[PDB]
Amino acid sequence: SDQQLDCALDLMRRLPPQQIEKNLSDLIDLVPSLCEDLLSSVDQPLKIARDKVVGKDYLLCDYNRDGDSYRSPWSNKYDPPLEDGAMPSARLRKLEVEANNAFDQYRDLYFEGGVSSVYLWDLDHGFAGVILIKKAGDGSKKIKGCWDSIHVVEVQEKSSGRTAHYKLTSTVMLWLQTNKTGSGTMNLGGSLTRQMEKDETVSDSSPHIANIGRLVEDMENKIRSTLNEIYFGKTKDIVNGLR
């Protein structure tokens, strides 16, 4: 059991990253005891749902789940309907709507498409939030790809609200596929997880969302360069050392 957790995590690091969902399904089917422990440690590609009140897409994770229902960031309603589903406070929901709008613009500026969603919840000495971004590359028989990123941020306030400590845990899941005549079929698949702690001043001009925004932006920019130049470039050098 506890040792099987070590083996299941190891097996996920070695199986092809483009089949995370199918592998976790087959892995949990093999050992049902780990159904709870796997999903808590390995991130899955995000699924999309349509808000039925205002007709906008939003992304599903455990943080916006309650039972078998998911809460929409747009209408703040559960789907399937829940009479008494977990809601954020009025104060935090206001923040949540501003964070969704801000990262929506962020998504549009860096991704030019896809879907983004933000969910906040309260902690004893602050609040936490998730930022989810999904961008699929569809519309070509020969060139395919998909980006999924998940950002878990923890906010702790101090100095009577003038400074705050931000803890950020980010995972990017990326795959690319080209089918060309010279290079045949090429599949590149990756996942990268990184963390970042930081103190930032909280003011009228530098509010929590601006701090979280700059934090997520720097992390995704850094993870994109790392995936490209350190990790994908390394596999290229390995290819040129095989022959």
Binding site: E112, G113, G137, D138, G139, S140, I143
Partner: protein
């Protein structure tokens, strides 16, 4: 579907672009991303797509929602061969971008700067 058209334009799938034209679609319509097909091709240095789109009546000077022209897009992103193509086809290099600078004034690239003089 504009999301799929944008993906094919950015990645140089010339066949998909031909099907778009063959279906009687407008190579000058602003896509839902806010740019025109020439911008998406020029932004990603897709020389072959640029040539086809111009040959099918695309406006080489049309601005996008960012007030960027195709040529400015190719200059901003440092696609030398696309800068050379657009210039050879009559792209007005005097248009000021959203910062007020022209392509020559804005480019940090020397090889491109030499082509815009």
């Amino acid at each position: 579907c504009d999301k799929e058209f944008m993906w094919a334009l950015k990645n140089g799938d010339l066949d998909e672009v031909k099907d778009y034209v063959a279906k009687g679609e407008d190579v000058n319509r602003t896509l839902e991303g806010g740019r025109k097909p020439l911008h998406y091709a020029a932004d990603c240095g897709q020389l072959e797509i640029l040539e086809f789109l111009l040959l099918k009546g695309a406006d080489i000077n049309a601005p996008d929602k960012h007030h960027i022209t195709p040529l400015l897009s190719a200059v901003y992103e440092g696609h030398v061969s696309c800068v050379k193509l657009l210039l050879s086809k009559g792209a007005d290099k005097t248009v000021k971008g959203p910062d007020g600078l022209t392509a020559f004034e804005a480019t940090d690239n020397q090889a491109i700067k030499a082509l815009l003089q």
